[PDB]
């Protein structure tokens, strides 16, 4: 199944956004727009929010 995860910005900001990834799939690292920084920055998966 899929799990909702909290991608947390690697830019030092507290900005986090939620994505969906397969449980069997590896932890996610993804480029995403940082509104506070106003630039695309890397985000890393921190913790599993739920299992959907």
């Amino acid at each position: 199944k899929n799990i909702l995860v909290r991608m947390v910005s690697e830019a030092g900001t507290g900005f986090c956004f939620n994505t969906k990834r397969n449980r069997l799939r590896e932890k996610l690292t993804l480029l995403h727009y940082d509104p506070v920084v106003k630039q695309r920055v890397l985000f890393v998966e921190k913790k599993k929010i739920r299992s959907l």
Binding site: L31, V36, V41, L42
Partner: protein
């Protein structure tokens, strides 16, 4: 103090950011190249 701590941490991370992005993209591309190499066998 909290505001300046946030500002300096953001500045440091921004300084590291382009290198990190380039390294991550290079890692993705090299993983793809390894996949094609495995396809070649």
């Amino acid at each position: 103090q909290k505001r300046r701590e946030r500002e300096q941490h953001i500045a440091e991370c921004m300084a590291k950011m382009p290198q990190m992005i380039v390294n991550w993209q290079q890692q993705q591309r090299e993983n793809w190249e390894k996949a094609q190499a495995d396809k070649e066998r």
